[PDB]
Amino acid sequence: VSMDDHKLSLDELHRKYGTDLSRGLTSARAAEILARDGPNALTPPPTTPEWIKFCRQLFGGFSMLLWIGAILCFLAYSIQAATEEEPQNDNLYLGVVLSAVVIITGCFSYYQEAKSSKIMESFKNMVPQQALVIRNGEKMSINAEEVVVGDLVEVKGGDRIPADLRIISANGCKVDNSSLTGESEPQTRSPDFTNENPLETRNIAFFSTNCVEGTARGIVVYTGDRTVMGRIATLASGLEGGQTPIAAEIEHFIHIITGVAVFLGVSFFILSLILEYTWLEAVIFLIGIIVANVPEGLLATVTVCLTLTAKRMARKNCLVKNLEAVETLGSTSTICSDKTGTLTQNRMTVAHMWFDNQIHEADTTENQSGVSFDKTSATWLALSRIAGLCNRAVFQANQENLPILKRAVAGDASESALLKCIELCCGSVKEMRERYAKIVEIPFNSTNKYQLSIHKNPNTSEPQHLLVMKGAPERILDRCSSILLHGKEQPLDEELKDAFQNAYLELGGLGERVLGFCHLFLPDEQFPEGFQFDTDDVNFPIDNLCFVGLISMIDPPRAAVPDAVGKCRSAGIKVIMVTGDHPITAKAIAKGVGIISEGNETVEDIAARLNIPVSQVNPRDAKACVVHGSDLKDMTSEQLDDILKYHTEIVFARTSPQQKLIIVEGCQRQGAIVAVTGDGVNDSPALKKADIGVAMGIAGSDVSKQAADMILLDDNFASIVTGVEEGRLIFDNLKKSIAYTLTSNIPEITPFLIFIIANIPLPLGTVTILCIDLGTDMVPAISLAYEQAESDIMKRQPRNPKTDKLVNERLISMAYGQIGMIQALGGFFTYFVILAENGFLPIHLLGLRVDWDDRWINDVEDSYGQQWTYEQRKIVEFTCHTAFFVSIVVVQWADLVICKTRRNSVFQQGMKNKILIFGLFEETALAAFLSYCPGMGVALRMYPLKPTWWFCAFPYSLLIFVYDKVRKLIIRRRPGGWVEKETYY
Amino acid sequence: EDDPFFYDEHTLRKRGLLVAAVLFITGIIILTSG
Amino acid sequence: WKLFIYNPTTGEFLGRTAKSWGLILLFYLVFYGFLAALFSFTMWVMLQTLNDEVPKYRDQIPSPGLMVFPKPVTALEYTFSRSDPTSYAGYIEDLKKFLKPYTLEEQKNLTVCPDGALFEQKGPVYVACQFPISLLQACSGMNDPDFGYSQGNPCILVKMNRIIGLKPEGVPRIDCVSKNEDIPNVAVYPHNGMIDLKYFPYYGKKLHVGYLQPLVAVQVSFAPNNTGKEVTVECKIDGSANLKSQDDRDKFLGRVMFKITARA
Ligand SMILES: CCCCCCCC/C=C/CCCCCCCC(=O)OC[C@H](COP(=O)(O)OCC[N+](C)(C)C)OC(=O)CCCCCCC/C=C/CCCCCCCC
Ligand SMILES: CCCCCCCC/C=C/CCCCCCCC(=O)OC[C@H](COP(=O)(O)OCC[N+](C)(C)C)OC(=O)CCCCCCC/C=C/CCCCCCCC
Ligand SMILES: CCCCCCCC/C=C\CCCCCCCC(=O)O[C@H](COC(=O)CCCCCCC/C=C/CCCCCCCC)COP(=O)(O)OCC[N+](C)(C)C
Ligand SMILES: Nc1ncnc2c1ncn2[C@@H]1O[C@H](COP(=O)(O)OP(=O)(O)CP(=O)(O)O)[C@@H](O)[C@H]1O
Ligand SMILES: CC(C)CCC[C@@H](C)[C@H]1CC[C@H]2[C@@H]3CC=C4C[C@@H](O)CC[C@]4(C)[C@H]3CC[C@]12C
Numbered sequence A: 001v002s003m004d005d006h007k008l009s010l011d012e013l014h015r016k017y018g019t020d021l022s023r024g025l026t027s028a029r030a031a032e033i034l035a036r037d038g039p040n041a042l043t044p045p046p047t048t049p050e051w052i053k054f055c056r057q058l059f060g061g062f063s064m065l066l067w068i069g070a071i072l073c074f075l076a077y078s079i080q081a082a083t084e085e086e087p088q089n090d091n092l093y094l095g096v097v098l099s100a101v102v103i104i105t106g107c108f109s110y111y112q113e114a115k116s117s118k119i120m121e122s123f124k125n126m127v128p129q130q131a132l133v134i135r136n137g138e139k140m141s142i143n144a145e146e147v148v149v150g151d152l153v154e155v156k157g158g159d160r161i162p163a164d165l166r167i168i169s170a171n172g173c174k175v176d177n178s179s180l181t182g183e184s185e186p187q188t189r190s191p192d193f194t195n196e197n198p199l200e201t202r203n204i205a206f207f208s209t210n211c212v213e214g215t216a217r218g219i220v221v222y223t224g225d226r227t228v229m230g231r232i233a234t235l236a237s238g239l240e241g242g243q244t245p246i247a248a249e250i251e252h253f254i255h256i257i258t259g260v261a262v263f264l265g266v267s268f269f270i271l272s273l274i275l276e277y278t279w280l281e282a283v284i285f286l287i288g289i290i291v292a293n294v295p296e297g298l299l300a301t302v303t304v305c306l307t308l309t310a311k312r313m314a315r316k317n318c319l320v321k322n323l324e325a326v327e328t329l330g331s332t333s334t335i336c337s338d339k340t341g342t343l344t345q346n347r348m349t350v351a352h353m354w355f356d357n358q359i360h361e362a363d364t365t366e367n368q369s370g371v372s373f374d375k376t377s378a379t380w381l382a383l384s385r386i387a388g389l390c391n392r393a394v395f396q397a398n399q400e401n402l403p404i405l406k407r408a409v410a411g412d413a414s415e416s417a418l419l420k421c422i423e424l425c426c427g428s429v430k431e432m433r434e435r436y437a438k439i440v441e442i443p444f445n446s447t448n449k450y451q452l453s454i455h456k457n458p459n460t461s462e463p464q465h466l467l468v469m470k471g472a473p474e475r476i477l478d479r480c481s482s483i484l485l486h487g488k489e490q491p492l493d494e495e496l497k498d499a500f501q502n503a504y505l506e507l508g509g510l511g512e513r514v515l516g517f518c519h520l521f522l523p524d525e526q527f528p529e530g531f532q533f534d535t536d537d538v539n540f541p542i543d544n545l546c547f548v549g550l551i552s553m554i555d556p557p558r559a560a561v562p563d564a565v566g567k568c569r570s571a572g573i574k575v576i577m578v579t580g581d582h583p584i585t586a587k588a589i590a591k592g593v594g595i596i597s598e599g600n601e602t603v604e605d606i607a608a609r610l611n612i613p614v615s616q617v618n619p620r621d622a623k624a625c626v627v628h629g630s631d632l633k634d635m636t637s638e639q640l641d642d643i644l645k646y647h648t649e650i651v652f653a654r655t656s657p658q659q660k661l662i663i664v665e666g667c668q669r670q671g672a673i674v675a676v677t678g679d680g681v682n683d684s685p686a687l688k689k690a691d692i693g694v695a696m697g698i699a700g701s702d703v704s705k706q707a708a709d710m711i712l713l714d715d716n717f718a719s720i721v722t723g724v725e726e727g728r729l730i731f732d733n734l735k736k737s738i739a740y741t742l743t744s745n746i747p748e749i750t751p752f753l754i755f756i757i758a759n760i761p762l763p764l765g766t767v768t769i770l771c772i773d774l775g776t777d778m779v780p781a782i783s784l785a786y787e788q789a790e791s792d793i794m795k796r797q798p799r800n801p802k803t804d805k806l807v808n809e810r811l812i813s814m815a816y817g818q819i820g821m822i823q824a825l826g827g828f829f830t831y832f833v834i835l836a837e838n839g840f841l842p843i844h845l846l847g848l849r850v851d852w853d854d855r856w857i858n859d860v861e862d863s864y865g866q867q868w869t870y871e872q873r874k875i876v877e878f879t880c881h882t883a884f885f886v887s888i889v890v891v892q893w894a895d896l897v898i899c900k901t902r903r904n905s906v907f908q909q910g911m912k913n914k915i916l917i918f919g920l921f922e923e924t925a926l927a928a929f930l931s932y933c934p935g936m937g938v939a940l941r942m943y944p945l946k947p948t949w950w951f952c953a954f955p956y957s958l959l960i961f962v963y964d965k966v967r968k969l970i971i972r973r974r975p976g977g978w979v980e981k982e983t984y985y
Numbered sequence B: 001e002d003d004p005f006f007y008d009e010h011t012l013r014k015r016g017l018l019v020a021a022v023l024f025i026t027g028i029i030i031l032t033s034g
Numbered sequence C: 001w002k003l004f005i006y007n008p009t010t011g012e013f014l015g016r017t018a019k020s021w022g023l024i025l026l027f028y029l030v031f032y033g034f035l036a037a038l039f040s041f042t043m044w045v046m047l048q049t050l051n052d053e054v055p056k057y058r059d060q061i062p063s064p065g066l067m068v069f070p071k072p073v074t075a076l077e078y079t080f081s082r083s084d085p086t087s088y089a090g091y092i093e094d095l096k097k098f099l100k101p102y103t104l105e106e107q108k109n110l111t112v113c114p115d116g117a118l119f120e121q122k123g124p125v126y127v128a129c130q131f132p133i134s135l136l137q138a139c140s141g142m143n144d145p146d147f148g149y150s151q152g153n154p155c156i157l158v159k160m161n162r163i164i165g166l167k168p169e170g171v172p173r174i175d176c177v178s179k180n181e182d183i184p185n186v187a188v189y190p191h192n193g194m195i196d197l198k199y200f201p202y203y204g205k206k207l208h209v210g211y212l213q214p215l216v217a218v219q220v221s222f223a224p225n226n227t228g229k230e231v232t233v234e235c236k237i238d239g240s241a242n243l244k245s246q247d248d249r250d251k252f253l254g255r256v257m258f259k260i261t262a263r264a
């Protein structure tokens, strides 16, 4: 199905749709079509039902391994019951426990993911897609839903195309059709019909695409699923296979730990089979070892962290497309920010005017008129004419009732400020543009930095060709050969240029954007009344104009910017300002917001201070630099790296969209994670190139928001600091949880090794091995994801991805060599106490394994002479197993308490985490219940502990706390020392 | 006159269950703190 | 792993072997030495509280369980051949080793006590009554070096496990009944089971020096007409209310079962 209006002529368009090509349909017609044809929204496809995701949670991660373990336990119980009489129910009560644990963990993870997904979804509909449509001859910004078939819309740079529209008048318009064609090369658009194929023609846009630059009026021809995208079943929002670094680290750790655990389990299975075990017991032992040596519930901690971050970002108005991309935001080491719209409020008020070789203070003052300055000579009239003709900004529909300053303008900030000022002094810009026929207009772009227009002169002495131009004063003055003073055209000598430079220094030095203006009367001999102007041809005299003056408008820095910049520069993040404005204005703004501090001088600043030329000054004497954009063109890759690594305070002025990409790639080459804050279409590739891209929720275009990984819904620069802090907190909590989880592996594998080596009775059994792991390592480890941020979370340098990893050689060393060893010693001490208080002294246990485990030697002798039956001494052995589990609980109290923080005191951290205290209380309650519940001896072989057998692990639980406290005190006292080098994980 | 070969295991497990109940109640109360 | 253990450059064998490895090895040596010292001190403090003569808790070993001697190779199953002296040599050697202290010359120091009365002791002397080996008639090595083996009448000693301070009530007795339809005759030799009360209580290995516990010798008589066969015998304590012998979880508490298989 391929039917369109691409080959249809313009004459039938008015007849077919019943809408004017210029004025368009009225509000009543738009409402009728909307009520008839419906809204402009694709039908949301239901991807997966709720039961699909719940099963994915149930059978994801180590939960499948636990399902396998439970199934094998049930099979072992079935075989045992079928073979023997009076079978043991250990396998049944173990399989039930494993299945219940899997179900509970899956339900919890599903609930957390549902919360996170709902919170993330609540932001997709928050941002309304705004489209500019000409209705009743006036342009209005409406939602994309209300766009109907028939009306004409305006598409410009960075504006997402609302619907399938037929271009009727495009200038400089290039569209990006990577969604359909696949190539990112822009394609030009012209009203004329070129290609027969509907897709290959150049006079229609096929929706879901964007215009990189230029502007185009086009009639919307299709709406909703009737467009090309709606016909095909391909998913428009196709997620790419992008893996975040934190996810890669987690996956690598999971793979390594699973391999290690499987190796240990297989080795222990073989060793137990060598020690005359039984198959139905050896397989259960292997399952216990494998399950206890893998960190199940690690993914639940990650899910809780993501949900907490999603909750926190929602209160700061920070849309995040991928919640796992906040770790990179916390790992950010460089921030490249734009001056206008990010570090400034983007509210421009005209402040000063330089003309007639004089600076005039301009104040709006809707009432009481100007302060001291007046109409002056005809130079002001010429400047007002230039500003009126050059501007393409107009007020919104039905807005000519309120005062001009409060009125809304649908143009750029500078254009809006100029329009308001010229309507305050002069008036009726609509009639002014009616007076002068704007035959030719060159759209403004950052590549040229000037705006040009051609008008027909209606004066008595009319050359019929007036060329008006505005733009950057240094670029503008480079071509305006003459100057207009006192209304008389005069040559531009060196003195006037020096005066202009002094005026630029005075106006720009206060932190104001300055625009220079020129008008030229084209000769009639070279150009008759009828001339065919073309962009490709030179035609009009682009050079040799007449200068008039400069208009300087203020733009105060945003209120929250200075504190955010201070926090970033105190946290170790280098803030670079990349702007297209003059170095004077950029440097003044940077000093205002705190990017360039007080006491740091530029090379030019040092030269001026010492009254010496710019040369002969050693560049290393200056830690702050303001690199001009034109100088960056001739810089080398090595030369740029010297700039980016020797200067703490770097500003880039008069840059271009490509040079921002060059700066970003250089910063990324210099081993830095770059966060680029861009809003316009001139930041689209830089946002994609940066490690973390930040757009603006209001000032940002519709392409910057689509290319960025984060959106500031209130444009607040004080949200980047919050994002960085939360990114650091995620990593801290994850590594704390991993460190706590890894401590319990040694106490669960050392008893079997000591059993084999010393031939003592078994200190710990499979049921107690799985009780240590499922009781103390899941809830307390999930409770560490709720831990608050440190006191100095934002006072530490950004983590080096290579030097500092999620799991390093110092986390493994600590967990497996100090805390795990202390816990194993505590468990062994409790086991020895229990066995010695019954008769078997510690030295009598060396070599008792063979006789202790023999079912037919029912006379095993004490150290006191008594003789024990097999079924009598196994009761004592299982009491020892229970005490080992209970002492691991006690020694893991003061391991969770010390993993609660990484470098600060626990007293300073506090007790805000209610989940951690809940986990401690519930694990000790579970231990007490397992020990003292009637019927546990028959079922799980758990026997009551005497009251004094609980305090055996107390001296070893205090040792962990004291050791950690002293080592963290040493770390703070001597930063960078041996302890922090080797012990700080 | 005390007698060996016998321990008051009924009272021991009764008090252990009471302590487990107290710990469970306290952990629930702390979690849902108003 | 390229350049995994390369010696040149500042980085040799991952961490610097000259300094980093030495420092970390010293740190872990000191750490584990302190941990071992703390564990040893804690164990010493625990062992100081205990008594060297009687265990702190005796509630996990409340009642004795019988056990047969010698211990066979495979699970209380005595297999021997009359014409093969190497089959029952282990049983004979074990019985001779066990019954060496019970010989008359070995127990000449032990005192003689009246029968039927519980021998309670208070003073630190803690004498031990002597158990004459003549009670186990025809099941001792004094008459024939083989303890009834090589004639088809093997002798097995059934002895009660020792518990410190246990005072049995009534008159204990071990009665062995053949579960093989009583085709052979099981003869508990000290008349009945007849476990005399003068050998109780037991006061510990340290206090009670030279203590010899009562023994019961059973002699399954394999008749010449039926050569071979398998005889299942169960001996339990029957006369004392103190000594429980009806627990189902523990199949050796107060009772014992065994099988004798003859050949040729
Ligand atoms: C910052 C420090 C980090 C480093 C920590 C290092 C470790 C040292 C810290 C210790 C603080 C926690 C202490 C926990 C004590 C164990 C708790 C427990 O699980 O002990 C269970 C046992 C069971 O013995 P049983 O009953 O079977 O013996 C009765 C038999 N009879 C008659 C024969 C003798 O009990 C006992 O041994 C003790 C007897 C008392 C048990 C009841 C009291 C416990 C209940 C507390 C809840 C109170 C509410 C608290 C709310 C505010 C919290 C801030
Ligand atoms: C986690 C991996 C390692 C796991 C280790 C498992 C535990 C160690 C296992 C040991 C097996 C043998 C233990 C028994 C040794 C003989 C004990 C002994 O004969 O006790 C006697 C002495 C003194 O008694 P007394 O005369 O005062 O009693 C008189 C009082 N009355 C009369 C009342 C009794 O008691 C004493 O000295 C104190 C007892 C000495 C115990 C030494 C334990 C050494 C363990 C070191 C582990 C440290 C970390 C190791 C790292 C390994 C990887 C590199
Ligand atoms: C501060 C840092 C720098 C210093 C650190 C080093 C000092 C602290 C370390 C160890 C000292 C405390 C442990 C002393 C135990 C004496 C037990 C004894 O001596 O038992 C002796 C015999 O053992 C044994 O048969 C068992 C031997 C194996 C078990 C004990 C092993 C002890 C080895 C421990 C080294 C562990 C090292 C771990 C870390 C490795 C890196 C350093 C004496 O028994 P007996 O002849 O009376 O038995 C008579 C028996 N019947 C009465 C039946 C005739
Ligand atoms: N409507 C307009 N017509 C002509 N020139 C304009 C203009 N708006 C701005 N300019 C000038 O063009 C120059 C190029 O600025 P550009 O548009 O590339 O960056 P920018 O200032 O708009 C955003 P930022 O300041 O955050 O980098 C500016 O110095 C400005 O003075
Ligand atoms: C005695 C048996 C049963 C268990 C003893 C385990 C001990 C010897 C093992 C387990 C964990 C191990 C540590 C794990 C990790 C590292 C980090 C590495 O950079 C140096 C070695 C070091 C520090 C290991 C030393 C040896 C170690 C402490």
Ligand SMILES: CC(C)CCC[C@@H](C)[C@H]1CC[C@H]2[C@@H]3CC=C4C[C@@H](O)CC[C@]4(C)[C@H]3CC[C@]12C
Pocket (backbone or CB within 6 Å): A833, A837, A948, A949, A951, A952, A954, A955, C042, C045, C046, C049
């Ligand atoms: C380093 C410092 C803290 C060590 C000093 C504490 C030592 C001496 C304390 C702490 C824990 C104590 C033990 C706790 C429990 C028991 C079980 C009980 O039935 C007999 C006493 C015994 C065995 C205690 C002996 C003394 C003990 C080992």
Ligand code: NA
Pocket (backbone or CB within 6 Å): A291, A292, A293, A294, A295, A296, A741, A773, A777, A778
């Ligand atoms: Na685990």
Ligand code: NA
Pocket (backbone or CB within 6 Å): A292, A293, A294, A741, A744, A745, A748, A773, A777
């Ligand atoms: Na574990």
